[PDB]
Every structure is written in C-alpha cells, then in structure tokens.
Amino acid sequence: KPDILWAPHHVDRFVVCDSELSLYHVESTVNSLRLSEDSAATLLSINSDTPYMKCVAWYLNYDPECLLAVGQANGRVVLTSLGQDHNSKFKDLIGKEFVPKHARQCNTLAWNPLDSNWLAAGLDKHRADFSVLIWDICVTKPLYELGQNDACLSLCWLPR
C-alpha cells in the first residue's frame, strides 16, 4: 500500500510513494492537486524505474540532494535521487545495489540517526542465510550481519 514521507529537513516537500515515485511541493498561493483552503500541491519530478517495490525510506545526512532507498521483492536495495541532483560534494552514491547471497522479499529499511552511512535491511526466511544485514553506503559484503534461519518483520534504532 502507498505511504507518505516528509523530507527530514525540508519544510514544504513531501514524497508520494506508490507504483511510481512522486515528489511534491506545498504551494502557499493562498493570496496568489488541491490540498486545502490555504494550500495546493505542485509536482517537481517523477520516477518509475523501480518496478515491483516493497518499502521506501528517506536519507538524512544533510543534502546529497534528496536520496531515497527502495527495496525490491527480489531482495535488492537501490538508492534513487529526485530533484535537481547537481553540484553535490558526494554525487557518486546514486545507483548502487546491495545483492544478498539469496533471493527473498525485503520487509523493512531504516537509517541510524547518528551516522548516516549505516542502512539496515530485513529479509524473509531461508534455511542458511543471515536474516538481518547492516550495509555500508561508502556491493558484495555487509558490514555486520545477525540472525540465522529466522525472519525480520520490523526494525528501529534506539536513539541512545
């Protein structure tokens, strides 16, 4: 089912996640789609190059433009970026994909809010595979990895 997302430091930019990814801007033309009797929505970009998606998440470092992590039903995670996406001090992050050493559905993804270079992925069950993997954005090898012959259904980071 489609969800919604607010960009971590943006004040008026939300992203609609559906069969196709969409980015909107809350238009404040009250004195000058329709949101309410004080604002409407404007579109700035769109992308549908990730068919059969499962879950989405937002990057938070400060501004590699606007990164977005999506998880396919095969088990791979692909980082995608919408917007201007020009003049970035770190612009090679786009396009990578972390393949597990098997094929299973991906349930949840999350970021550690202390250092922005840790991404956590959960996958369905298998006979001889690590269920949870912690990657490193800066691929054939996860940094750490936990679990064996079990399934992860939800993740979160303790901010302590």
Partner: protein, 292 residues
C-alpha cells in the same frame, strides 16, 4: 537450540504414472487457488517411476479413491528444529534416531527442513532426545512445553544433469500458472532423469526443476541464488514401501550441506555442484567394509 512438534498431521499417498488425469481437477485448486481449500500443507514431487503426494487431512477429502492410488498406513506427524546447519541437524537428529530404529523421512525446503515421523513413535522420540535442545510442542501463538514427568541397499544411480532450487512470490504465481501447468502433466507424452518438486508450506513456495526446463520461465520473475550455482543429485533405490538413514549417516561425517527429499521408492539427496568428487567417492569407500 529448540525443537517444535507441529500439528500438521500429514498423510502420504502415491499417484500412478499413466492415470494422473483423474487427479487434475483437485490439484489445480490446491496449487493456484488458495481460497477454495482449508488444507495448509501440500508438497508433491515427480519421478520417472511415479508421483508422490504430501497433504494434510483437510485436503485429503478432495482426492477421490481410484484403483490408481495406494495411500498409506499411519498418520505421519511433523517436527521442526530451530536455534545449526544441515549437517548439524542431520548429525544431531537422523543418526541418533537411527541408534534404535524407528525410521523417519526428511522433507527439505528452500525455507526450512521438515521431519516427518510416525504416530506410534511420539513416546520413543521424546524419550530419546530429551537429553538435548529445548523441547516444547506448539499449540497456539505460544507453545505448550512438554515435560518428561514419567516415561519408561543398492549402488548410486547418479543422474548427470543439473538442477536449480528456487522459490516464488505468492502474488506472482497467476502470471506463471499456464506455463507451469504445461510442465506438470501435459508435456508427459540413461544419462538424464526427470524431476519436478512442488511445495506450498504455510504461505511459502519451494520448487526444484532441471536447468533445461528452467529456460521456459521468465528471467527476472523467478527467485534464485545470486551467482547461478546449480546442484547435482545422488538417487538411491529401495523397496515398495528406512532408506534415508543409510544415505545420510555415511555422508554425515563431513561438512557438506545435504538437501534431502523423499518419495515412496526412491530417497534422494543433493549437494553443491562445485565439488562432487568428494560425495561420489566417500559413499563408495563408506560402502566397502561397511557392507562386508
């Protein structure tokens, strides 16, 4: 380190080769049409000799009794073990149960590894490995612990083709059903053998098909390991019904991730294709002396 006795009270039966077409109405229901049947345990595999059908009691009623189908003697139960590789499970289960001989079939899967015992053995089994990992039978969201309060051959036929073990997305099976149905029972008119295995277990799919038969299906819609590593099998024979014990125990003394499958007559096995000169010769040396 825990053992769970589940409640899917399975029932085995053998479908003869010529007259499958009687049992075509029910099977299509079970495989691709979930919401029309209550049964939640189904796994079938095909061999040149015959057809083997695993199903629980709910699905049993649908199958009509013909003269093409001998069924079973006893209502097999199901066990499962969890935290531990395939070698660990085999060494700690299959041979200790062989120490005093109540035989057992093992059905594997891309998700777990099931064990199917017989009803009369539920005292002897719990009496044997009660000196081991945690044991608690599951009834409900939380299992109900079981307390022990008081209780006192032939050579290897080795087909030389390549297999591929792979899963499927349940929200995708309709897009494949037609191509899959043609394989199962429509296109059925020494160095190679034929093998198909289907298994729907509590919402998970594991199937085993030859590499040649794999080319028919689409590419990105399947689900397989990420390097393309096939397998190769070692078929053993037997009487018209254990066989798996003397296929597992001798090759239990290693670090090889065996993948077992069982039928009525045959009792299979699988190994990673990269190295076979180990498996081939180990059982040959473990045949001499052991035999006589």
């Amino acid at each position: 380190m825990e053992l769970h006795i589940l409640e899917h009270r399975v029932r085995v039966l053998s479908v003869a080769r010529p007259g499958l077409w009687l049992y075509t109405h029910p099977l299509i229901k079970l495989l691709f049409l979930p919401r029309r049947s209550r049964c939640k345990f189904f796994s079938l595999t095909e061999t040149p000799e015959d057809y083997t059908l695993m199903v629980d009691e709910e699905g049993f009623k649908e199958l009509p009794p013909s003269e093409f189908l001998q069924v079973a003697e006893a209502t097999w139960l199901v066990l499962n073990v969890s935290s531990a590789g395939v070698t660990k499970i085999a060494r700690s289960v299959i041979a200790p149960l062989a120490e005093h001989h109540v035989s057992v079939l093992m059905l594997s899967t891309y998700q777990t590894d099931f064990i199917l015992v017989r009803e009369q053995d539920l005292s002897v089994v719990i009496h044997t490995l009660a000196q081991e990992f945690d044991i608690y039978r599951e009834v409900g969201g939380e299992p109900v612990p079981v307390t022990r309060d008081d209780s006192s051959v032939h050579p290897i036929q080795s087909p030389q083709n390549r297999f591929c073990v792979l899963t499927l997305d349940p929200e995708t099976l309709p897009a494949i059903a037609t191509t899959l149905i043609d394989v199962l029972f429509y296109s059925h008119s020494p160095s190679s053998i034929t093998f198909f295995a289907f298994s729907l277990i509590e919402g998970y799919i594991s199937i085993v098909m030859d590499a040649e038969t794999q080319k028919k299906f689409p590419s990105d819609l399947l689900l397989t390991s990420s390097s393309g590593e096939l397998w190769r099998m070692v078929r053993i024979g037997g009487q018209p019904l254990g066989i798996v014990a003397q296929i597992a125990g001798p090759l239990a003394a290693a670090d090889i991730s065996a993948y077992y499958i069982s039928t009525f007559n045959f009792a299979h096995a699988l190994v990673p294709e990269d190295g076979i000169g180990s498996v081939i010769e180990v059982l040959q040396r473990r045949q001499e002396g052991l035999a006589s």
